[PDB]
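Sanity check record (used in CI):
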Amino acid sequence: GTSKLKYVLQDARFFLIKSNNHENVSLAKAKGVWSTLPVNEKKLNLAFRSARSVILIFSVRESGKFQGFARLSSESHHGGSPIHWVLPMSAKMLGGVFKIDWICRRELPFTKSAHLTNPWNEHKPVKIGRDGQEIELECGTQLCLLFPPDESIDLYQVIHKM
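Expected output for YTHDC1:
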């Protein structure tokens, strides 16, 4: 192992990302991209400049689980290859596209994070939060450390982007 993972998470910022469907998380895992509404896009761009790592922790609404977590590798940018998201809307509602590097593509059930509370959301269980809710450093670090190890990922290349 967990040492390189701990290094990547050192002094990181963490954000809860809530997807309405599994399809969008599958696209994000395959293409290494995410897009959000402008309110969250602005917050994520500010955070990307502010911190050594910005971590998105993903949860599909109604799934009872997190589906993994990823590190922003860029600010949002427009005009790339269009992404066929399943919109709740139009592609014009979204902000830009963020490039992300997955750190863990394995699931974590909410039942396993019941002992973690988020001070930035009234110390409610970390699973509770609107899309874009920031997770305080200690809570977010412990949450990421709860996920099963993803032995398919090598954090060597992610470390070099820091």
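The first helix runs from residue 3 to 9. If this sentence no longer matches the regenerated tokens, the check is flagged for review.
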